[PDB]
Symmetry: C2
């Protein structure tokens, strides 16, 4: 049986800007780097950056909705988003829902999100105002 997410690997076009983004701007811990990759952690998350000649810097209009959301407390949310805005990090979507989300891009166009709240909270909100066709199990 599967027990959780083991690691998330992102393909990157250039290692140095990606390490700077994840380690210095986002504050993740850098454990190791080599000529074609790096290992970082963010809480329990193991993140691998893999240098890939096939990776293109992809505008948000040209990629689908696949995205990766990081946990943050409500108290820290606004100052963290403001840090990203000062650094010139692009936003790919406005939050149109209740609850706190900030949608931002990494240097290669991977779609990222800051989100406050758990699955249990989302399910409780949906039980009150379900999406079209929603069934619970």
């Amino acid at each position: 049986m599967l027990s959780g997410l083991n690691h998330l690997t992102l393909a990157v076009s250039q290692l140095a800007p990606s390490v700077a983004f994840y380690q210095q701007l986002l504050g993740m811990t850098l454990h190791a780097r080599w000529d074609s990759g790096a290992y970082l952690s963010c809480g329990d998350l193991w993140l691998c950056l893999s240098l890939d000649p096939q990776r293109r810097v992809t505008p948000p209009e040209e990629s689908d909705y696949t995205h990766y959301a990081f946990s943050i407390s409500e108290a820290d949310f606004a100052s963290f988003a403001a840090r990203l805005e000062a650094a010139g990090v692009a936003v790919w979507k406005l939050n149109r829902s209740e609850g706190a989300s900030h949608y931002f891009l990494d240097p290669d166009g991977h779609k990222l999100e800051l989100h406050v709240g758990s699955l249990a909270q989302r399910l409780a909100a949906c039980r009150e105002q379900p999406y079209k066709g929603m069934v619970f199990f």
Copy 2:
């Protein structure tokens, strides 16, 4: 301060075959489904499947190395991988070895992996046989 992964959202071209893959084949827990998405969990992982007509199915040879690995125990690894092969799940290939892993594709061409071992175990293995240019912090 970021504290880990909040959720993983995958864009899918057809909801029902994707839900069946993650729930029936991979054994993830289905919490809710609606006309354009589903919420599942795998241990601590919150997985969202989102119906996206912009999702294309690309051969693994022409998509980049971005991929998502799930944890499995040493005792369950070989029999789970054998079950995926017997179900006809397609494989893909990574450029380097990262330990005990099985690489497979989901119905929309997302690159998945079964992996045995933690980041700490990977770092210890790399100390004994490092990648080219490796530095440990």
